[PDB]
Design a binder for this molecule. Structure first.
Ligand SMILES: [Mg+2]
Ligand SMILES: [Mg+2]
Ligand SMILES: [Mg+2]
Ligand SMILES: [Mg+2]
Lengths: 587, 587
């Protein structure tokens, strides 16, 4: 119900509630006043702000509480609390009274403030956040409890994924004043003409009550009116297409009227671009695209998984400079701010739900109770991002046990849910793990694009690039042979590389070996006609939990965690600026 | 044989053949002249001198060759080539003729030059070294051959041990002119008086032919005569004991006479000190000793496993400064130069054969064909090092599969061999692996001292010092209970630590965690009465092969490979200078 990005309009007052909140790790009664003994920032992960390991490793309920002054609310208006996200679970309280809940730490949700408080001077907002992950949540965790022999139970979450379980309120919290009779949702679809000069637009505006008129004004990038409609349909000539690294955005100003007066107004951006997957190719605007980019992470020093718009722009500027053109929201939906940035900069985005960890240590599909959370995640993501021209593909899961029995039955309705909910019917994919090699895999028949995470030379044939090349070329041909019409994209491939580590003997973990690894990989990729994309793992080093294979987090980044480059960055820029975005390898 | 250290005496002309030799990786006919296209230094490992990975990873025969001018050799003299070691196997050639052979890369051997060449102007010495390791060699390797489909055989050695397979001529090669009738061995033993003020010296001088008189002169550290005998036995008064970090060495000048004229002369050093293991204690000069020190490696940059006397003295000076008192020759006998240095500096040495890798990647003892090499290793080591007062204990194996069936039958005669060969009958031990818990192990009953390699907090309970502390304390108490009168020494304990890695959250691989790991370890150790020693792994970072657990070699060193300290070095110096060398924890 809150998939529309929060705006300041003539009918919508949007206030930011970010800043210092009273904080507590542990139990709390929302009817009681949380003291200011401990405080916390919104938005940010709380973890790296804790000095001790004990508090940084906390699992369970943790509270945010602050008294907010009530703004003027008219009779025909309603006041809601719009969360960008709360990680992972949340129960929201107003004056000690439960007013909303949400499960899933990477999707936005709104909560209605009771009308009986609109004339009060202040309201106390309490946020009960929860970072527990188990077999019912996305992402998947291994939950356990141990008795401290002190009388209390201590919770632990052994992650089923390769990234640190950062938690907290990671995205902006807004106090929204909006009309009771308001615009609920906007869907924008287009059919491009045969000459790509015209477009048949369709605006599906959802309301909660009914209005006499639904007016839509369309403006270009010069803020010039180019179209008007009251019947949810509009034809437009002299269109400017949204292009890769050359974006063009229109704005649809939607106005609803009752008795000839404005009830609510909203502005939704959109881009004109065509997507089609056919004949082992990914077509953008009817031209073959070669994906060049990164698997990423919402990860930065200090803030952790918290929003940092400066980081987004810095990352995307580096992406553009290297000659790259895309990235994947691994392994969870990123902030709306990032998606809007990608729209504005013309960066292709592979959108992904938090479906990572669907893998036992078998009998995975008798153990995974994630169906409910998986369906909601797909519902929320599509509803939130369906209008983004940057979003070009959906991901049902990252490295699930797609070789075990019951896998095909699990994913078929989920792939279908993507196809049913997305009005653009964009391609959906499943990110494949090495254990699910062509013969054993039983799910890749459901998707439109084959996405592979392969580490020949790092995990398999470690430090053995000679035999790694034989292995990767062998399997890529197997995939291409099993699905002759499906395009292939490498979504993950890389090697842990610590800055400063050097050698003349192609030694793993050194900067030179990272260069050698990618050079070999690309030699193989360029020989596969159906391979239409390469996305490295990762853009930058990121935090993980404690595992012997992890040398203080993950170091497969091309850049360090401070966005400083490694040796391999210079090499990628040469390759990526040589290969055009529109690149046909069928010739 | 070649047990005696090469000396320059009036009867023995010893020349060093170190320098630049003509070199070749591959096949060679010793009847032919090796060109100077490739050269190599003696002594050093050849590996890190190769720029390419291909030549560095070479396995098989590799040749050293040089034309050497023959010096004056009289009628009663012979000329031999004395190799400190050749790693791992060697065939020696003089003018293309096979003249000597040795197996085992860490023990000395001599080879006779044919008498028919003593009046030649020059001789051509060819060394056919070989670095192949398998199930018949010490250390144990996993050998395999793969055809490159070019018609050639590519050999590969997969090491069964955690250190790089450095190879070459690592130790000085001497050209020795000695009398045909010479002293080939000298054994020095002593019985200390009850007041430790006197000593009964016994000498066993071995010659290859008959001699009329064996005269032995003993000189103190002031080079003053304190005794002389023709009966190979001598009583000494006002003796000065060899002490920990306070060494006193006597010199035995041994002269053999034939027909009233000097036949040969040699000088052998020795120290007066007593060793006894009893009641869960290690007694040196009848006082309880607490071992503080390191497991080491013959490893430096550039030289690899090659001898560096400067490195030996630098390391031993650091050892002394930190308050340490001992080290272990893991996992192979070190250079004679190191042993003699330890004698001079009063450093305790745990002497060790290359019996590492006796563990199948169960049924280890149905696959290990190492019996012959193991017997030779023990024979060579004892014969070479028995006169060193620094040597206080022998190691029969490092981390073998001592929990599997057949282990006891394998080690029982090998432990016996140490006792039979060593005239001092020093304690022998077995370095135990973590898989062989007190219940599973079936070999520790044979040894005098229990040596344990434990990594609670690193390998088991990784980054969980809380649960690690419980685990290590639990097992240590089990060992103490199973063997109530056997002393316990921790011979390996540490955590990989890369210089520059930092955190406030006790993160593995950081310098802080290394401190935390050792702090926890010591808290446990101090509560175990039978634990009489702690030797960390490792003294310094060292090179290993390629595998995902190795971040460019092993980083468990207290010092970096360049001998620069890590954060923990300061903490160890505090502890080791508080705990005396003579420290009784029975009280
Ligand atoms: Mg910020
Ligand atoms: Mg690969
Ligand atoms: Mg331990
Ligand atoms: Mg103590």
């Amino acid at each position: 119900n809150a998939m529309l990005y929060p705006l300041l309009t003539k009918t919508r007052n949007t206030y930011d509630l970010g800043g210092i909140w009273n904080f507590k790790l542990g139990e709390h009664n929302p009817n009681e006043l949380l003291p200011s003994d401990e405080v916390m920032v919104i938005p940010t992960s709380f973890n790296d702000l804790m000095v001790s390991k004990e508090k940084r490793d906390y699992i369970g309920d943790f509270w945010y509480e602050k008294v907010i002054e009530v703004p003027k609310v008219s009779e025909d208006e309603e006041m809601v609390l719009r969360f960008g996200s709360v990680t992972h679970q949340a129960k929201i309280y107003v004056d000690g009274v439960l007013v909303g809940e949400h499960k899933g730490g990477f999707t936005p949700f709104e909560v209605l403030v009771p009308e009986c408080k609109y004339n009060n001077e202040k309201i106390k907002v309490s946020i009960c956040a929860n970072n527990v992950l188990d077999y019912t949540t996305l992402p998947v965790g291994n939950y356990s409890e141990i008795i401290q022999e002190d009388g209390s139970i201590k919770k632990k979450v052994r992650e089923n994924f390769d990234f640190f379980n950062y938690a907290g309120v990671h995205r902006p919290l807004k106090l929204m004043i909006r009309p009771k009779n308001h615009i609920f949702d906007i869907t924008i679809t287009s059919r491009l003409s045969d000459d790509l000069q015209s477009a048949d637009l369709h605006f599906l505006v959802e309301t909660n009550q009914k209005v006499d008129e639904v007016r839509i004004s369309v403006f270009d990038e010069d803020n010039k009116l180019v179209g008007e409609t009251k019947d949810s349909r509009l034809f437009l000539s002299d269109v400017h297409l949204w292009e890769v690294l050359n974006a063009y955005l229109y704005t649809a100003r939607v106005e609803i009227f009752v008795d000839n007066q404005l009830q609510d107004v909203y502005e939704e951006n959109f881009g004109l671009r065509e997507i089609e997957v056919t004949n082992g190719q990914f077509l953008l605007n009817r031209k073959p695209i070669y994906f060049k980019g990164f698997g990423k992470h919402e990860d930065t020093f200090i803030n952790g998984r918290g929003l940092n718009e400066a980081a987004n722009l810095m990352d995307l500027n580096l992406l553009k400079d290297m000659g790259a053109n895309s990235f994947r929201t691994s392994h969870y939906p990123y902030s709306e701010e990032m998606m809007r940035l990608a729209d504005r900069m013309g960066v292709l985005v592979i959108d992904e739900v938090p479906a990572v960890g669907l893998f036992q240590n078998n009998g995975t599909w008798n153990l995974m109770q994630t169906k409910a959370a998986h369906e909601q995640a797909i519902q929320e993501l599509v509803k939130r991002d369906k209008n983004h021209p940057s979003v070009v593909m959906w991901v049902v899961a990252n490295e699930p046990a797609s070789h075990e029995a019951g896998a095909h039955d699990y994913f078929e309705p989920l792939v279908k849910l993507y196809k049913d909910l997305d009005p653009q019917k964009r391609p959906v994919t499943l990110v494949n793990i090495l254990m699910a090699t062509p013969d054993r895999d039983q799910v890749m028949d459901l998707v439109d694009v084959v996405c592979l995470n392969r580490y020949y030379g790092w995990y398999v044939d470690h430090g053995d690039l000679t035999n790694a090349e034989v292995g990767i070329r062998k399997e890529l041909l197997e995939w291409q042979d099993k699905f002759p019409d499906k395009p292939i994209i490498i979504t993950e491939y890389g090697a842990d590389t610590l800055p400063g580590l050097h050698s003349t003997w192609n030694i793993p973990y050194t900067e030179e070996f990272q260069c050698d690894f990618y050079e070999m990989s690309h030699r193989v990729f360029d020989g596969i006609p159906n391979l239409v994309g390469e996305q490295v793992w990762n853009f930058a080093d990121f935090e993980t939990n404690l595992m012997i294979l992890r040398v203080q987090g993950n170091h497969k980044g091309l850049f360090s965690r401070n966005r400083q480059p490694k040796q391999v960055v210079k090499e990628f820029k040469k390759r990526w600026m040589t290969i055009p975005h529109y690149h046909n390898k069928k010739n």
